[PDB]
Write a protein that binds this ligand. Structure first.
Ligand code: HEM
Ligand SMILES: [C-]#N
Ligand SMILES: [C-]#N
Ligand SMILES: [C-]#N
Ligand SMILES: [C-]#N
Lengths: 497, 497, 497, 497
């Protein structure tokens, strides 16, 4: 059958004509019989001296680690990134230093709300995280299949996520939670419109785009800086699943995305993406009609054309999912010299969040895990110990900086870019920033009559289950975007009710 | 709508005019604005001094804990156990001390192989664990919806579960794994047959029975003991779901069981099970045709009649699923005086696995979690400290035993019952015990022509995706149970191929 | 004997009449014999059935939790804080609202470098953390027995602590590490001088002062803010131990401080401190001869007189040390309305560090631990789940903000004080800020001749073990503080060598 | 000076020619300035953008792991084991296959009661754990500097340890707890006599002996078995410290043992031990005057002569203490083919506790830690996943046993030795086995008058602080050993009181 199915068969064949290895305990002690336990008499009790049993059972009892708080359901692959164009004028990052340069990458695709045993083919954003193992350390471009997001302030994220998951008492999905939050926070209108459009359910991972979403900052050798947006378009072309097909598949194969990806790579059909960037000078950001750092807004291509950079290619499957995919950790704060963060509140928050959640999910020394190790760089610092320290722990090197004993030294050229900001240090309300303009353009221009029909149907089909006062609020927001938008949805709601 | 859907609504209503509480941090400090972060200027960077943000974010980052290694997907409810008959001549356990006595209980139903985000209506045995909060500590009767199991030795459990879960490399369900194991371990025939019958997909948790499965031991007031089986028949009657219906619902409502149960209880339709026990004297155990402790065998009702004991009633929904259901922990080892283990190898292994995995999943002091607390009993011992020690840690009471300072004392009446055992201390092979006899009785008499047909197309439907050599090995086992069994399955496989 | 020694006797006596409790397992099951394990025959192997054994052993195996990264060895006590003067013109904090108002407090004293099994009477600063359980949440004033510190930038803290602890290879205290860091980092000159003076080794915890050290911000009801310093003078008078005595006691009774404190409280000698604050207006913060936020500087009493506020009284010993002292956690970030942080880089780093380390050392829900619970406030928010969720997890309350269902609301009045900061966002070097002026005043104006002699003797006695080149740089720094300071030390160094 | 002190200087010198390494974050990103944090202006608050700070600070915050519940304070070293004599007639273990065969070993010496920052030179037994990295996996001989122990049943261990540690309320050493336990459990007399003798405080780890203590079982190539005791005498000779000197050193240098070992190895003075065994046939096991599996009994050399086997040599110091020593784990259950446990109840309990405590202290995958990995063996089994899985996690190999795909197979020649038993599975009382005979031989025949005098002074010196009723009971037991033993002690107690 397919490569995925033949996993064990192929493993067996690669062993060809050779006796199996000796079965041992965790401590390497050979096992004489791992099929029966030690008892006193054929029908007597179990003995504690049956260490083979305890050793195995105890490990079995510890196999699970907390799933990701979000994006728990996913798939992974490996490959490389190749520079096809010269953008050193914008960024001095080693990853882009010269055309033709190849850097190893690790990627993980995923949904968002569903837990580990949920279906792939469901409406939801799609995680598209890329780990670049550069000479200047790891660069994690933790993106999604959408250029924007539901909210513009990180302090609402925990709440947004809660509204998207299970009811605290019933443990069931709750449309009142979903829509009460969205209707109360109309800034989500942009991404909500994108979510309920055709692209809400990509036909697998290979048929969707990737985006850094946030506005990032690039710094060149001269210490000059510009802002940018990262884009990685699918070379396999955009392709989506119909509501009917997605539902059928969620039932027939909940792991459609995993299977698809594995089999494609296994058969030589390596998926690739064309990497681009949008650039905006500091002067332009000052004149941009919206907040250039507002995650609910996009940079119009007409005004900010896509500048080609390279290719993203996935040509290697994982050998052990848990070890290579479940344990992989992407930190947006993982940016090498030449790439920095912008003042986007959402990104700013993610700077803290990811490393934090990883220390809990994987452990303090989660960077020691092979797949997370920045193996194309030499990690040298004054960090020591911590649980599960699986390396030399930097031997006997002086553990304090500064020191007169030859220990690692800071590298001045790697110093960050400095800007002067003005205004008081407080909480600035962004609830009232433009929440409808770009959405209108999306509804009218980016979509056609046919697409606007499905959009409204998808939305009404879910919103119909929220209480009436919530439907009204939601529709009020939609109407604000465009009369036809709100009225079409209400018309459908009317029939459901 | 249904009560489940109206969870938030009712909660709101249950707070009439009552003013909303003040939103505070974890440390209880009031929050002035939890809707915007602190930045330097309207479009400046995030500040560390915004502890409101990190306080909330850090917790969000740590919401997840490892799901159960098995039976991860489930539902929970509470109620009580009431004694209707007098079995004090068999067991002195306080929970049975007198007719009419009620003991608070906690229950959790679940599937087995699927992770946290999987569907309820899938072919899989069903967990049915009952926790009795007695005065002699908690009594955990961790049962299933079947009186038997797939294997008879605990050292094969980890391997079995592995074969039921995802392929190590692809992270996909693997039929070669499932059938290679079962075909290699024919003792599984009995429970496999039950699994692939109509009983494999119950119509929710209320329409299935519960069993302790294992043979346990009861001790009366005179010190005499007998072996027993626990049974709890559904008073709502046995009802199953068809393969089509189950498949449909798995997509329409992956949380069918949680919903059904919550709603039944929320509408006053409290589900109940009649509690029975089977009794086998030590003498009868000598003559029983098979190993009375072999978990793949049942005690024929004809020879061992069900003795009514009481009722299990579920009249209360959990208020917070995570705290009351996700965190609940059942240990088969939790048995009060009057109820003891039997030499069943599988039960013996479970005496270790449960609290062991619990110390990992929940933590060292998992018994401190409210839902796991033996609240109807006074916990007094010499155990101290441990992570997250939420209690007075037993104050300044002497922490060693024995002691001359009045600390807790062991009670002679709590001494366990002794059984004489003799023979060699070694691993006795049980792979060759009877694997077909009882199975044949089920295929031939418990099932009719119509059911046998479904059983075979259910098996063949899954087995067909396994390699031919595995198919043949499987059919041979079935042929040994009954020529018709094997030949009917082979016939369906042939057309599938 | 002393009350501490008679702990068990008094406990035994408090139960005079009373029959001893039943010894149970963790789940509350009575134990018949907890003095003998279950074996097959008198000289047979141990059986897994012995859950009594396993249950207890498993908990003993998990008694230990990581000690504090710094300040590991300590002592705790409880009492109250009583307002004696009116400072509402400076702060609106409820803890200060009315003269005579009492607020329960928890306190923990400690050394810094030594691990849990180290001696109390050693040269090292002393921790003096105070937890105020207020109606506006807990307020943690995590101070030391000194008004200043060794460094003025938090990013150097880990290295500093490293240099103060064990050598990474030898696990031995390393004077080369100690002095290389200090000589390379002359900001330490001020605190080093305090450290090696007579107050380096207080005669117990009751004879030392307490300081908030950092500059903090106070806000009154009108929104006006001022900077401040917190001081808590010992009412028992300052009393130190001679180098000779401290050494003898470190051997005779490593737990001198714990014992002293316990007996003092046990015998009615309740220690108290007089609470004061120094105030500096934003206007005065401009003219100050030094950086008012530099932790290596103090505010001269002449220019900023101590203003009396209240009393700190300790009148209750811990009932269980582990539960109330080892598990206690103080977070400088725990500040209620009316009390805020200043731009002191050091304080700013601690804002993150404490809660971070607590989630590791204790666990994600450490605030659930009784002693850490802000029990005089109603914790109401949108944070849920996490390991060891010991409270009702806020039941079924809507878990997302904002919401239309009545869940907790933010109270605007608690908003923080906003200030306009000017300058570029970058790393500003502060290594060269005045490192001697105040140090010289201390040497010349605060101490007398015999005190200067001891200071030098103490410094030289420890410095003499560092390499000559380190001794030179160290002496060069002291000489810059005052020519007679450096020469005196050099003279002593000369003979020890 | 000494090698230990010159640790850093030597490290620097080794790096003679070489630019220092580039200072990086955990992710391997070069750091431009790790001496100043990012703030808004020279006197502004800290920014979240400073991931350099958070990265380092967060790891510092997690440096600590739980100390060993017992034997927390210790020292480690490495070397080898060389077989000098042929004992293959008794055991088939590969570690003994031929004369001259060397196996790498890892050793850790330690005290027992004291925590991490406690002193080395104090009365307490000494841990002498030896890890042998054999081809048949790791063999852990977790010994002590004594052939016997305080108790004979593992269920009293938690309590014993509790009495030896700190009072639960005061957190102080409690002689009432110490002696109440010992006086109530007279079986401790034998080891208490050893502990309070001159060997109670050995001069460093090199001048003490080591013993496996328990009775173990050896099996040869043709399944014949005999019982044995492991002995390893110091080739540096027995050397102890006087009470006065031990007290002084505990103040002058708490890390005395650590320093002694390091410098000794650093200067080429490699400490060695001569390894022997005592052999008792199954028939002699019947004739032995006492229970040969009683931990409080020794095998008289006259009847069971020491049989030379090999040498233990420590020639390598740790490079990183935390990594090689603090994280090292010894499990008595780690026994390769040829060496097995005996029915010694204490040993049977240790079979469980150790792997168990390690899963808590280090982590589920603690065997993956370099110093714990059985590197001279091919670990092949069916164990997968778990926190911090730092290897290939065995790749895509079939994860279930049995299978038809060439995965690891059990090896029939590695089956344990089977013995016949007969008796009730119950708790047999051993509290009344002989508790004085061998102790008398020690007091009378082994010690001379000086030593008995010192022994009594040592006991009384500590015992005098317990309550008289405890003193009397303790003396009664000593009197049961010998009239002179009790009278001499009583005479001293009279004086102290
Ligand atoms: C920027 C530098 C600092 C950092 C990063 C820092 C970090 C820490 C950490 C991580 C702990 C252990 C906390 C626990 O596990 O409970 C600790 C404890 C402590 N620190 Fe700091 N600290 C710093 C500066 C100071 C200063 C300047 C003071 C006093 C004003 C101070 C006083 C204390 C005290 C008293 C404790 C012990 C609390 C207890 O008894 O539980 N620290 N510190
Ligand atoms: C992130 N989701
Ligand atoms: C159990 N499963
Ligand atoms: C804090 N030290
Ligand atoms: C063992 N200690």
């Amino acid at each position: 059958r397919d490569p995925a199915s033949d996993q064990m068969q192929h493993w067996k064949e690669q062993r060809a004509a050779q006796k199996a290895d000796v079965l041992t305990t965790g401590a390497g002690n050979p096992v004489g019989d791992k099929l029966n336990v030690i008892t006193v008499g054929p029908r007597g009790p179990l003995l504690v001296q049956d260490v083979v049993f305890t050793d195995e059972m105890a490990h079995f009892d510890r196999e699970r680690i907390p799933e990701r708080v979000v994006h728990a359901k996913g798939a992974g692959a490996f490959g490389y990134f190749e520079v096809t164009h010269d953008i050193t004028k914008y960024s001095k990052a080693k990853v882009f230093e010269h055309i033709g340069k190849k850097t190893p990458i690790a990627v993980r695709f995923s949904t968002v709300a569903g837990e580990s045993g949920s279906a792939d083919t469901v409406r939801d954003p799609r995680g598209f995280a890329v780990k670049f193992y550069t000479e200047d350390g790891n660069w994690d471009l933790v993106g999604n299949n959408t250029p924007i997001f539901f909210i513009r302030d990180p302090i609402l994220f925990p709440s947004f996520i809660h509204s998207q998951k299970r009811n605290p008492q019933t443990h069931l999905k709750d449309p009142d939670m979903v829509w009460d939050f969205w209707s109360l926070r109309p800034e989500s209108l942009h991404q909500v419109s994108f979510l309920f459009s055709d692209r809400g359910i990509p036909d697998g991972h290979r048929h969707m785009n990737g985006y850094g979403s946030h506005t990032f900052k690039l710094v060149n050798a001269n210490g000059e800086a510009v802002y940018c947006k990262f884009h990685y378009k699918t070379d396999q072309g955009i392709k989506n699943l119909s509501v009917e097909d997605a539902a059928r598949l969620s039932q027939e194969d909940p792991d459609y995305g995993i299977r698809d990806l594995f089999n494609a790579i296994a058969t030589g059909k390596y998926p690739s993406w064309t990497f681009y960037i949008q650039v905006m000078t500091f002067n332009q950001a000052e004149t941009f009609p919206f907040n250039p750092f507002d995650l609910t807004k996009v940079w119009p291509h007409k005004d900010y054309p896509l500048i080609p950079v390279g290719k993203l290619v996935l040509n290697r499957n994982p050998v052990n999912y848990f070890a290579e995919v479940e344990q992989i950790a992407f930190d947006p704060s993982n940016m090498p010299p030449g790439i920095e963060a912008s003042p986007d509140k959402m990104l700013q928050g993610r700077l803290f969040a990811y490393p934090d959640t990883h220390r809990h999910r994987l452990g303090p020394n989660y960077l020691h895990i092979p797949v997370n190790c920045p193996y194309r760089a030499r990690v040298a610092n004054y960090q020591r110990d911590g649980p599960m320290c699986m390396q030399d722990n930097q031997g006997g090197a002086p553990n304090y900086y500064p020191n007169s004993f030859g220990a690692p030294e800071q590298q001045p050229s790697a110093l960050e870019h400095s800007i002067q900001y003005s205004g008081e240090v407080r909480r600035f309300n962004t609830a009232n920033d433009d929440n409808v303009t770009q959405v209108r353009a999306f509804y009218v221009n980016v979509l056609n009559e046919e697409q606007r029909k499905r959009l409204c149907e998808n939305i009404a089909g879910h919103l119909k289950d929220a209480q009436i006062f919530i439907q009204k609020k939601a529709v009020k927001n939609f109407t604000e975007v465009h009369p036809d938008y709100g009225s079409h949805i209400q018309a459908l709601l009317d029939k459901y009710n």
